[PDB]
Symmetry: D2
Subunit: 451 residues, 4 copies
């Protein structure tokens, strides 16, 4: 009872050239604004539907009708993340297995344990920024990346990257960044066999070895003893099959966590810092809460949760630019979406989170303005209207940890510094598969409080 | 005595790679934002200084200290616009000659003369928008180009480009456009002799030929009309008694054609953008238009009384002045602002968009579209607002442009309600001028007839 | 029974294999590696490349196979339309134009074109006389000026005046660029990517350029009624015996484009190649120059005299054997059939004759296939049937074979009569490939023998 | 002064630099020489040089009392990872004459007898690889010559086993070297080396030097764990004026130097010979003839390698037509006049186009392009300085005897054991790094069924 909108198609190439930007997500957003809540996007070999209104999004988040689909994006990341929690299909050996082995390791009770090491990495950042000279500035995404990676490596696997002791990035991080870019780059390749991509292929494998070799370096330090993320993997057993996780799979989970945490949380903080320096009154409300609550030289686990405004900023940043901008679904059985669009079994849907988070119908007509005050009552927001961490059983396992980190770090930054948008930086959002601000720089004057 | 800041330089290429964007002006504004009111900009074989605070620009506008310089930009334009007014040196032969011959034709008294022909073109645009079907949209920069170009050919030269009767741009307009891109592109070539730049060198001569050709049919076909073109054929220099030679005239026509259509097309487009982005201001101007434009066709008198429409235009050109910069050189040794010593011949660049963002002058809300700043146009300090250049070398076409945009904007506001149906994000395309790219709207006609 | 096929790249088949600027030569190397036949697959199409006289002989059976419009020719049809070269044998305008024009390329017709042919030829000789001592000759560039001017004057009584220019006629640059675009579409897997927008639009403008002067020439003569006895009046006045009607204006415009392109592209390459092999084989140059001197006894050559340069004709034939400027033609099986007892073909299957490789079939030419020996052709009937097909086959064979040979023989004769040629650069053969073949950096210096015209 | 020197087409401030914007610079300089003759000026943005091609001028330029070895722009770029090694050092630099006198013993004819055995080891591995191929397959000639030449210099020279024949994608070191060498050539064409577009290139290059210094600098320690080899001569030899052995970092520069120069020159050299053999079947016959007659043991003897006279002649005739290191550079020690026609300021640069020298028609006769190895039957008939494939003077190629022995040995064994088919009718295509090798050259080989 409704023909679905579709953008300009270029011959046999369908809609693919339309996402021949350096900014595909943002290109999909611009399409969403022109065609409305749902549009078909077909490329050679695949077809999908992108949804942008909460009315259709809530139905797709009905777990009896739709199951998580591996988007072409995720299908290409699977070539180095394999059977990890992020890139495994729901119905498959290790998803449920790893899911129940690892879920205890991220429940609110796990956070109390990670808190000490999180603080460690957070002081290094504060000390680095403290120790900068006057004429210097801060490269925000890079230092957030230094932070996030160091924090997961210590909390999760008790491995010290020492990112703050390095100027050129780590070999691992560069391979991870190059691998993700390649996964993205395969989306626009109309035929991946063309010889033009031979060097691109050769490097892809060279970086997969670099990561896969290095992760086993993490494994060497232990069997050759501490309440940590890795221990649960080598040591937790399935209640039905009795076994632990395979050595090959434990690998993929590590790659997954390293990639997921360091990438998603880097954008998150950077965006929060971006929005703070652009909204100085919000900064004021957030900076004062920092001083009043963070009364110790270093924070305690209990003190973090009181930062009720710092948390609101983070959520409001994540509303506007969700660092994992999309998740994919398929129909378990034949169905009708919204009484208008019939779906055959196996058809793919794409939830375009940033555009869902821009539904005026839900948020009012100031969808675009950075106002953390929307979130004082998280309970007024309808169901499936704010889904930055996915949905259902395949929802983000790393939510409670990421939020702990972001709120922790942001608090200490606001407690210890004031930040000047000394360049009048125009937001430039880089798209690998995640989103991050690119070239964001600030200067920070230390408030002269000791640690 | 104050040492001047300079951004990052790359070996023998100096600051040249920093502008290896498709957006140099915008990249320079970014540099201005990091380095402050003035910075030195070095390229291979050249040096200039970019000024951004009203403190420095006011000095540089002393016609006793500084004269108009042909920036590297304009030096490349001189290859197809030659010694026309825009691309002339002040003291060269044809400038003051041509300037004093033509000023009468851009005086306020000529406007009453052009007004009919201007209305003619504007009715065409309005009828084009009325005749769209419901599902269709409007391509704003492209239709402003049809409008601005057709307007000057009819007012100036009684030539009908018929852009509204065409879907791919006119062959003249496209070569004229491609010539501008090459002038810009020559800015970025570290060595223009490289054979990679040979296909370009060939297209360039063909485009110069295309425009030079079209003009000469207009100019020769004349040898009964009181317009810019006969003023050129008949105007006489009071010292030598002769008109401009046919070559210089050709150069004036080319100059005007591009200069008007490029700046005025961008300008109207920016106004439409800022209006759809601030609907109260659209409301007030729409209300103001409806009350004043009370006849089926607007009159010359009524256009001076679209006082709010004019304020909008002033506020848009404040934000994005479609001709974004002018250049100056020091006539003799001096110090600029007590801090920066300058040798004779040293170059200055007025970065008009950054000047219009000097919080010191405009307040702390610079980035806001508020036409009410232009209630009292006398309230604004001198040398704070330079959209039309400066001095004797200031835009000779200010009235005509202002008259044009104001007439056109008003009729659109009287005749349509406009929908930003795509939530268009501003993307400003750079030739040498500025212009929004991909700006589209939907327009529902108010069914007022013409 | 299973046919060789070169290396395939995923869903892209063999197409990346000849993403060179020189496809024919890459195909010549596939044939060298894989032999008399190999399958060449592209997205959406399949063809078989044949190189042995054994298979070509069957492929020339007009009762079994007909002329196919190769993918290449399919793209040329975008501006050569319904011209003789790009017509299907069963299309309406083919047989029509064919029976109408054949007299205009006959031998009695050549006697008529000869003088205007001579006209362009003196223009070439004088330009070469009037050069100063230091300069060289840009050989392909001057052969192009000559061949184009000759077809325009002989065919259409139109003067391009190429010798009075440095920028080629505005038209020939389009005509050349259209050919390059036609060639360029061969390697584009996705023809729709927006990157080919400047290409596809420049293309449409170049077609506008060619049609303008061709429709001007065809209209300008439909007013002066002038009885030049040339291709153009023969097209305007000749009538089809079945419909009683002459060729439509749209179709004539296509034959002109066809003839301008066909003559200028094939013959200039041909002359260029002959001259290359001559300056590279000085003993052969001597014999031809001697025959040139002995026969060209008049201030300007006469038609009877041209018949008589038997050795330059053998040179020309030996040149077109090594590098046939039009390197391939295509056929399809009119019905299901088996080729050479090993390869069954369904009706409609496409075959491609790789003429350069055919002309190197050692079992036919002997063990010295690559040496330039014009003495192979002094007994022309000794050559087996379908062993030497530089002009195609059967009813679809080149209509301009005679006209071209006359031009080349005449022109080459005069060059040898009037100059001594020096390979002052030791030019290494570098063959540019558009749709036809021609050498690229070829230059020589020529000392005038001071014989007058 | 008498004679204004020719100069090819100039592109404004970019001079004639665009003339070598091929992937085949050397071949372009030949095409220019063929039209402008025995000498021409070649200008670049920051430099000017003169190319010599006639034996007449080259005989003068090889006067060691007037000219010395210059570092061409090319060799200046190799100096970034080969540093102070013999190939990239100035004569008056402190490590040249130092390293030169300690190493001459390791390449004297006397030294060869020792290298002979390990030379054979790698030589059989190659023969075994070819023997074990199935019939439908072919031989990728440059790749297998690169495998051999590198394994031989690495084994015979430093007792390190690369084991190239046990891998299909090339060694990381060799892939890094070739990419480092490619970067050196790639710079020659950049009139803007500061431009940001070259950041990934500058990055990768810096990573590639680390790769070489990694393995090589480990090898110097890995031996301190002493036999009689090139590395031992470097670790143990003493300079008589300061009495010191070579610098630890200088040795790293020599090893890198020797690995590259050998593997790049010798592999190219063998490949070219094989091309000429399969293209000249009668020469192939006579060459396999002597091979069959002399190579009478399951393994070659040192004496026997010397007793191949025609195989050596094919080698000489191969390097004549395509000398794998095609050029060397010189500077004027003082002001002087070249050929009585061209005056030179002190410090002016000369480039010898060895391929063009080796085509000087007045010297070799008019069949200069023909592959005729019998030109080398009487080597004393060849004029002094007409045939300089190994450079000139004290700066002459130190390894020419090692190289000739390897090429003679290997080429001999190939001719004994296989018959070769140009089964694809391969057209000669020259890959240019700084050195010259042929590309995509392939043959099929039918075994003569003979054991080792
Ligand atoms: C470590 C970590 C950290 C994190 C964080 C984050 C942030 C900030 C954001 C986010 C997100 C997300 N996630 Fe996240 N995260 C993580 C993780 C993860 C994992 C493992 C996963 C998978 C799970 C399942 O489902 O199985 C996720 C998950 C996730 C999601 C979903 C996806 C789909 O496709 O559905 C989302 C949307 N994550 N996230
Ligand atoms: C027609 C026309 C129109 C116009 C418009 C306009 C607009 C809208 C804006 C503008 C601007 C300008 N201008 Fe303009 N305009 C014109 C023009 C002109 C001229 C001619 C000139 C030059 C002047 C003199 O000096 O003479 C100008 C001018 C001008 C200027 C200045 C330049 C310099 O460098 O100095 C500026 C800034 N404009 N504009
Ligand atoms: C005008 C002219 C001239 C010429 C020349 C020549 C030369 C030198 C060479 C040649 C060739 C040829 N052709 Fe040549 N030609 C011509 C033409 C022609 C035509 C029209 C054709 C088609 C035919 C029919 O079909 O009808 C030809 C044709 C021809 C051929 C065939 C085609 C196919 O596809 O088969 C060939 C191979 N052609 N050719
Ligand atoms: C081991 C080795 C091996 C070799 C080989 C060879 C071959 C096959 C060829 C050759 C070559 C040469 N080298 Fe030689 N080689 C070597 C080496 C060398 C050295 C070390 C050098 C340097 C020495 C001097 O001079 O000091 C050379 C050296 C050489 C030379 C010279 C360089 C210049 O710059 O002068 C030449 C030309 N190589 N090579």
């Amino acid at each position: 009872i409704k023909e679905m909108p579709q953008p300009k198609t270029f011959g046999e190439l369908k809609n693919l050239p339309l996402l021949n930007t350096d900014k595909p997500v943002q290109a999909l957003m611009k399409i969403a604004d022109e065609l409305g809540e749902i549009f078909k996007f077909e490329a050679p070999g695949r077809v999908t539907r992108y949804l942008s209104s909460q009315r259709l999004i809530k139905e797709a988040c009905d777990e009896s009708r739709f199951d998580k689909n591996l988007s072409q994006a995720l299908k290409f990341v699977r070539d180095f993340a394999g059977d990890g929690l992020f890139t495994s299909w729901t119905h498959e050996k290790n998803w449920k297995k790893a899911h129940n082995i690892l879920l205890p390791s991220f429940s609110q009770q796990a956070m109390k344990g990670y808190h000490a090491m999180m603080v460690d990495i957070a002081v290094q950042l504060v000390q680095k920024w403290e120790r900068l000279n006057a004429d210097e500035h801060i490269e925000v995404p890079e230092d957030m990346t230094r932070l996030t990676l160091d924090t997961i490596g210590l909390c999760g696997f008790n491995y010290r990257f020492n990112s703050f002791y390095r100027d050129q990035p780590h070999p691992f991080i560069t391979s991870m960044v190059r691998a993700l870019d390649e996964a993205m780059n395969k989306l626009q390749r109309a035929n991946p066999d063309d010889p033009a991509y031979d060097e691109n292929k050769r490097q892809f494998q060279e970086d997969i070895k670099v990561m896969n070799d290095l992760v086993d370096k993490i494994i060497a330090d232990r069997k050759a003893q501490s309440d940590d993320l890795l221990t649960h993997m080598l040591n937790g057993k399935d209640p039905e099959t009795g076994e632990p996780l395979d050595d090959e799979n434990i690998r993929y989970q590590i790659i997954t966590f390293l990639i997921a945490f360091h990438e998603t949380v880097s954008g998150w903080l950077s965006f929060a810092l971006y929005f703070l320096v652009k909204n100085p009154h919000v900064l004021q409300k957030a900076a004062e809460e920092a001083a009043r609550v963070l009364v110790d030289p270093v924070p305690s686990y209990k003190q973090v949760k009181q930062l009720k405004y710092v948390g609101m900023v983070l959520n409001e940043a994540i509303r506007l630019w969700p660092t994992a901008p999309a998740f994919s679904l398929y129909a378990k059985e034949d169905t009708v979406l919204g009484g208008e669009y019939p779906l055959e079994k196996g058809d793919e849907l794409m939830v375009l989170i940033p555009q869902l988070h821009r539904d005026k119908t839900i948020w009012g007509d100031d969808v675009e303005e950075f106002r953390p005050e929307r979130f004082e009552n998280p309970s007024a927001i309808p169901q499936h209207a704010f889904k930055p961490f996915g949905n259902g059983q395949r929802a983000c396992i790393g939510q409670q940890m990421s939020l702990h980190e972001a709120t922790l770090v942001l608090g200490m930054m606001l407690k210890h510094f004031d930040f000047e948008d000394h360049t009048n930086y125009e937001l430039d959002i880089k798209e690998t598969l995640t989103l991050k601000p690119e070239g964001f720089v600030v200067k920070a004057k230390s408030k002269k409080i000791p640690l």
